[PDB]
Symmetry: C3
Subunit: 103 residues, 3 copies
Amino acid sequence: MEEVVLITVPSEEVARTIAKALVEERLAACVNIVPGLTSIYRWQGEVVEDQELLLLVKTTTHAFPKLKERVKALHPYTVPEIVALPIAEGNREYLDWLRENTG
Amino acid sequence: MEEVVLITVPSEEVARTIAKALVEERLAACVNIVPGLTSIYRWQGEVVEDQELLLLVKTTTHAFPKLKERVKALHPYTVPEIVALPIAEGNREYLDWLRENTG
Amino acid sequence: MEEVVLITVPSEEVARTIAKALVEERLAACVNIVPGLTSIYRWQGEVVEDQELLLLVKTTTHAFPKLKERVKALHPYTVPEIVALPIAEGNREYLDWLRENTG
Ligand SMILES: [Cl-]
Ligand SMILES: [Cl-]
Ligand SMILES: [Cl-]
Ligand SMILES: [Cl-]
Ligand SMILES: [Cl-]
Ligand SMILES: [Cl-]
Ligand SMILES: [Cl-]
Ligand SMILES: [Cl-]
Ligand SMILES: [Cl-]
Ligand SMILES: [Cl-]
Ligand SMILES: [Cl-]
Ligand SMILES: [Cl-]
Ligand code: NA
Ligand code: NA
Ligand code: NA
Ligand code: NA
Ligand code: NA
Ligand code: NA
């Protein structure tokens, strides 16, 4: 039920705006921003490159639907990367804090 | 059964101490330290920020209970982030090495 | 079915070569390169250290077998780290793009 959601963004500005918005709105309890990424992906049968930052979002499956909505709104690109990885287990007290602070 | 455990820490000092302790004690076969994170989380109905490093720990569900104990002991904060993500599949020889070196 | 595959490499050179090769060959739709990692692992009952970069690969279980083959070929080390984490859910349009561009 708890999840670590990955989202990449084009700038520190967007990274912080999204991280703050998600935590403020209780759609996530914690968000880690990892700067300096190089992203290589396919677009129109063409391999392109971009500079990005990674957001690691600690949330839940119940908040995810709302999280996607808020992210698509704040994110500048039409089809933003938003993928959730399941949390199999962890520090019990940490996960409780995670649920306790997510809506 | 094999897992990638995420742990964030406040300094390079703690990052290295925990990484070394886990590998030395065979509670993990490998630990990756990613520096330069910005963390934004909720605390007392207040969105706060911190500078951290991320540890990506390659371990197993059997070692996890012991890993949590050692991490809570070494980690300076009371409720440290310790979340395990399940490994669905991977390089067979790598995963064997992972189990072979984890207790 | 969709997965986020983690791979660590010894240099930016290898990181880019593998990222490009996987996307070009439609074995992945996107690859993120995170530089500056410190890796601590066990080798011959000895805890060693290395400088690496992390590749976060967006792919599928159907492409994984082929991905492993290509990675082992391009990667300079015999037993490279290749671990897949399952994607529980995500931006539907993003995941479709992911499958649509992976073979
Ligand atoms: Cl950056
Ligand atoms: Cl496309
Ligand atoms: Cl660049
Ligand atoms: Cl994106
Ligand atoms: Cl740092
Ligand atoms: Cl709190
Ligand atoms: Cl700062
Ligand atoms: Cl913490
Ligand atoms: Cl580097
Ligand atoms: Cl070994
Ligand atoms: Cl170094
Ligand atoms: Cl390796
Ligand atoms: Na991206
Ligand atoms: Na850009
Ligand atoms: Na943290
Ligand atoms: Na701090
Ligand atoms: Na490695
Ligand atoms: Na090296």
